[PDB]
């Protein structure tokens, strides 16, 4: 269709190995920093660059990821450089329930978050899955001591420690049975 | 007649330096427009015209329902 911006293509994937498209969000989502932290891609900045007509091979965010020169202008064959990116660590986002209060954590420099007035989201980065979950635990234990995330976060804090989350063996109905 | 608009519109002249040359349209300043604007009062077009920005009148509805044809 000639898309010109940041977008999210949503899919449902089955154990068979079959997948299905759900929708395209022609806009930013609230949880986009998850990608930003592992991709080192500033998404709203990327949205801005696209509106200026910057080709993908000329986007800074993309340049480090595809292992090329920081200032060259050579077009990149994105198919040919499929193997260069390997994700760098893990990010977990959790919805917790002014108007938007950014809750900064002293326990970890790689973890930050917010609660808004109403609802919010917290984002925890780590060098790898284990390290990021570890950082989340200390932050969420720290988070219960915080104000906007006390009642909401208790049932939530419980859910994150279950083996299913540890093993990434969850689905759309998971949380609803955890409480 | 819809007084509320009658009393706040401004005139967009064909030529200000000679009124007898006709006027182009009646309009509201954006401030004047910005008040009836909330209320489904007239149909206008925002316009920049003769240098100045005017709110061109396309139809008069008359806010009182029932005072029309």
């Amino acid at each position: 269709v000639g898309y010109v911006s940041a977008g999210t293509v949503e899919y449902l994937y089955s154990q068979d190995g079959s997948f299905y498209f759900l929708e395209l969000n022609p806009r930013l989502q609230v949880e986009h920093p998850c990608t930003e932290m592992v991709a080192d891609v500033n998404l709203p900045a990327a949205q801005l660059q696209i509106a200026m007509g910057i080709p993908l091979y000329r986007i800074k965010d993309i340049r480090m990821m595809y292992g090329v020169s920081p200032w060259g202008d050579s077009p990149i064959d994105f198919e040919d450089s499929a193997h260069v990116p390997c994700p760098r660590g893990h990010v977990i986002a959790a919805r917790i329930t002014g108007t938007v209060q950014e809750l900064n954590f002293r326990s970890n420099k790689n973890v930050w978050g917010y609660f808004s007035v109403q609802f919010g989201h917290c984002f925890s980065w780590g060098e790898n899955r284990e390290e990021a979950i570890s950082n989340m635990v200390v932050a969420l234990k720290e988070l219960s001591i915080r104000g906007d995330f006390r009642t909401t976060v208790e049932y939530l804090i419980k859910l994150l420690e279950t083996e299913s989350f540890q093993m990434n063996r969850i689905d759309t109905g998971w949380l609803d049975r955890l409480i | 007649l819809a007084e509320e608009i009658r009393h706040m519109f401004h005139v967009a002249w064909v030529d200000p330096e000679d009124p007898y040359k006709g006027y182009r349209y009646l309009y509201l300043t954006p401030q004047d427009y910005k008040r009836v604007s909330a209320l489904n009062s007239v149909h206008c077009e925002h316009v920049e015209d003769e240098g100045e920005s005017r709110y061109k009148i396309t139809d008069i509805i008359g806010k009182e329902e029932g005072i029309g044809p």
């Binding site: 900045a45 509106a51 007509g53 910057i54 | 920005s53």
Partner: protein, 106 residues
């Protein structure tokens, strides 16, 4: 580069956006402003390279949401459901035609 216009040339773009009108509220604007400004700071070492024009509804301001004060220019729009504010294209147009503006971020 000295300005958003210079960035576009070096990297092969075709539309200069130096001023963005934000058709939105909440956390998006806060992460987005810092995120664009952080990248712009990363790119230009100046967080105000992209100025922001905002629309202000009665509802959002009394809570003193931090994102409101960051913007560079404001135009009051009617509050309430999206048919009255962020989506009021004519008022946006009024904002767009009067300033005028070069881009909208929703």
């Amino acid at each position: 580069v000295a300005s958003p216009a210079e960035f576009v040339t070096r990297f092969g773009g075709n539309k200069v956006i130096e001023k963005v009108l934000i058709a939105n509220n909440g956390i998006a604007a806060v992460k987005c402003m810092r995120s664009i400004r952080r990248w712009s700071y990363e790119m230009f070492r100046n967080e105000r390279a992209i100025r922001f024009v905002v629309m202000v509804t009665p509802e959002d301001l009394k809570a003193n949401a931090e994102y409101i004060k960051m913007a560079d220019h404001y135009v009051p729009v009617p509050g309430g459901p999206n048919n009255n504010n962020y989506a009021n294209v004519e008022l946006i147009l009024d904002i767009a035609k009067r300033i005028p503006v070069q881009a909208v971020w929703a």
